[PDB]
Design a protein around this ligand. Structure first.
Ligand SMILES: CCC/C=C\C=C\CCCCCCCCCO
Ligand SMILES: [Mg+2]
Length: 141
């Protein structure tokens, strides 16, 4: 659900700053990872694709070929409150996007294209949070 995705996003986003330099991702492109979900944030930059690889690697969410590791992703998602309601759909949805971009061999570019597809399909399927839901989790600390 969108509520569960708010919790996943809020945690996953903590590795933005440590990944920023190696990804070449300007603060001007993305200042805080929660804005990935803004209606009018365009998910396009190769650097954001590099960042997402870097951030995923932190939680072993990539397989040897820089695609989603399905098992590790499922285990990560279920580590959040009610995570089991989202885990099957989210993997299925991401993997469907990956198949559509399998002919992009540049890893950063492939991953940003996959991210954009995942964002758009997440809205269609009802698992996209609003920024405010993401902030509400972050703000509990
Ligand atoms: C992905 C788990 C963190 C939650 C929200 C973050 C979304 C931004 C990344 C888009 C999809 C990432 C999945 C890796 C794509 C593999 O090709
Ligand atoms: Mg490769």
């Amino acid at each position: 659900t969108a509520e569960v995705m708010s919790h996943v996003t809020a945690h996953f986003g903590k590795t933005l700053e440590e990944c920023r330099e190696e990804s070449g991702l300007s603060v001007d492109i993305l200042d805080e990872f929660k804005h990935f979900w803004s209606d009018d944030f365009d998910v396009v930059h190769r650097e954001l694709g590099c960042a997402i690889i870097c951030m995923s690697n932190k939680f072993s969410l990539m397989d040897d070929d820089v695609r989603m590791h399905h098992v590790n992703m499922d285990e990560y998602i279920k580590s959040f409150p009610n995570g089991q309601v989202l885990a099957e759909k989210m993997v299925k949805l991401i993997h469907n996007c990956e198949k559509q971009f399998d002919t992009e061999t540049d890893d950063c570019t492939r991953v940003v294209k996959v991210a954009a597809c995942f964002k758009e399909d997440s809205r269609k399927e009802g698992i996209a949070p609003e920024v405010a839901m993401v902030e509400a989790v972050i703000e509990k600390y």
